[PDB]
Symmetry: C3
Subunit: 150 residues, 3 copies
């Protein structure tokens, strides 16, 4: 099975930036009702999508207390619980983060380490790449992810 | 086999919105020579791509009488005919629709039912997720699709 | 294994346009320190991503004299060397190029022929599709690519 997911958030100077489950030193951060971690949302949607389960807005509406104020790893782990319950064995996650600043290369090892631990995948099965927007979206972070299961 | 496809259309107020084969009640809709069904087009391109057959512009030009003014499901069905003639067995489709409004959640079941009927896939093999553009693309609909075959 | 990669480049009038390894006659071309071949870059990042090896800015930075000023096919061939040494067999590449002008349809045969020759894949395993940005990104070329291996 395969699943494809996307996320994006506007970025504001002076707000914390969460990506891949980590808080990143940065002059900008997501301006969103949640932690705005585009990487974990895209991955969560891709996982849900691989089983036709819906999307993060459907399964994690802030309307439910279980979801209100929570770090995005809560949503990812719930999506893994759901697909695992359906027989899935996650094999790979490959995703692209688009953002102009900050540079994520200095944080590559920690970002991949975090995804590896969160999704319980070997490091060679975490495919993380970074790009700028070349001016197309200078005030947003964007993430697009594919997952492979079985 | 895998295939990857994308489509996008300018939205304009007061035009009909078509997604996944259905009319969706909406304040806005595609500004196009097509019905502008971004989901249908992205899936068609994904299917063609999986066999290297070209893209919707090549295969379904409106300079072609069989395809001019036709609904986009006609093109999806012809793309399925072509890949099935080459021995394909579609397994799964996962796609993301990006649009600010209207909300697609209230139409989720009908949209997934439509793709399941049209591609003859079980509901758990239709992975449909929705997102807004968080202000990045307020006047467009975008779709990106992955298909898996054999 | 699967990998997903993206690239984009600003377009400017009177610069040469490189796509899939080829010069494309065009009013506009990449503004870049590289040849700005978005197709090559997205495919390279997708291959690297499939083994968790990093991205083109990590492996092929222009701070490294070995890679500065090289054509983008050089990087793609080295990515192919790296995954092959890890046991990979590339099976398929599917990618989408987004750009308003020039029209790529007249170049379709040559582009596909080039990717087939470069990746050593049969034409039915090169899935190339083209789209405009519909006004969303009129001064950029964008590429998004999925690869499948083993
Ligand atoms: N056009 C849209 C856009 C988003 N949505 C739901 O809204 C949610 C939140 O989307 P954002 O994260 O883009 O705000 C989604 O996860 C999707 O459930 C929708 O139902 N219709
Ligand atoms: N630069 C481009 C962009 C699109 N095209 C062809 O133009 C078609 C229509 O694209 P739009 O749907 O973006 O208008 C495609 O499906 C592709 O055949 C092209 O040949 N060169
Ligand atoms: N936010 C970002 C954006 C890009 N990068 C690195 O910068 C490189 C070049 O990115 P551009 O091609 O978008 O300029 C990448 O291939 C990635 O290594 C980064 O480390 N952090
Ligand atoms: Mg979102
Ligand atoms: Mg989000
Ligand atoms: Mg189109
Ligand atoms: Mg279209
Ligand atoms: Mg780049
Ligand atoms: Mg590039």
């Amino acid at each position: 099975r395969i699943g494809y997911g996307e996320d994006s958030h506007r970025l504001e100077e002076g707000r914390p930036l969460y990506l891949c489950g980590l808080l990143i030193p940065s002059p900008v951060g997501a301006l969103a009702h949640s932690d705005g971690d585009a990487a974990m949302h895209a991955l969560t949607d891709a996982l849900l999508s691989a089983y036709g389960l819906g999307d993060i807005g459907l399964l994690f509406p802030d309307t439910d207390p279980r979801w209100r104020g929570e770090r995005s790893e809560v949503f990812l782990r719930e999506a893994m619980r759901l697909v695992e319950a359906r027989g899935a064995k996650l094999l790979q996650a490959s995703l692209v983060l688009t953002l102009d600043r900050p540079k994520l290369g200095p944080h590559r090892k920690a970002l991949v380490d975090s995804l590896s631990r969160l999704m319980r995948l070997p490091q060679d099965r975490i495919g993380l790449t970074f790009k700028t927007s070349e001016g197309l979206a200078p005030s947003h972070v964007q993430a697009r992810a594919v997952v492979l299961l079985d």
